[PDB]
Swiss-Prot record:
GO molecular function: 2 iron, 2 sulfur cluster binding; electron transfer activity; metal ion binding; protein homodimerization activity
Keyword Electron transport among UniProt keywords: yes
Protein name: Adrenodoxin, mitochondrial
Family assignment from sequence similarity: Belongs to the adrenodoxin/putidaredoxin family.
Residues recorded with modification Phosphoserine: S3
Biological processes, Gene Ontology terms: cellular response to cAMP; cellular response to forskolin; cholesterol metabolic process; electron transport chain; hormone biosynthetic process; P450-containing electron transport chain; respiratory electron transport chain; steroid biosynthetic process
Cofactor binding note of this UniProt entry: Binds 1 [2Fe-2S] cluster.
Annotated positions of the N6-succinyllysine modification: K6, K98
Modified residues (N6-acetyllysine): K6
Cofactor(s) needed: [2Fe-2S] cluster
Keyword entries, A-Z: 2Fe-2S, Acetylation, Cholesterol metabolism, Electron transport, Iron, Iron-sulfur, Lipid metabolism, Metal-binding, Mitochondrion, Phosphoprotein, Steroid metabolism, Steroidogenesis, Sterol metabolism, Transit peptide, Transport
Subcellular location: Mitochondrion matrix
Amino acid sequence: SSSEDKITVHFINRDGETLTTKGKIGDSLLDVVVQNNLDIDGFGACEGTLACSTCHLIFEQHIFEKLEAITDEENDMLDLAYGLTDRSRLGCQICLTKAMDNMTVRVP
Ligand code: FES
């Protein structure tokens, strides 16, 4: 008698594993991971304020193209990203969307 929302998010460890964490259209990257005890030692640190450059993640196909755009500043911080794929960018921002229902990501 109020409301309820929660999506599913998957994170492929840099080792090749796969973590499962449910977000919630409106949440905020990092928080979810941090909420999962961040099982990806290396993820963002600065909270996503652009002062760590230890973030950057890979988005699932058809997902990255859905994700919102980014500025030039963040674009720079998205450079540090390793093996910048065709769907890799700096995360720890924006909020989950219905287009993220079971969104899979990878940790390069
Ligand atoms: S969390 Fe430090 S820039 Fe993304």
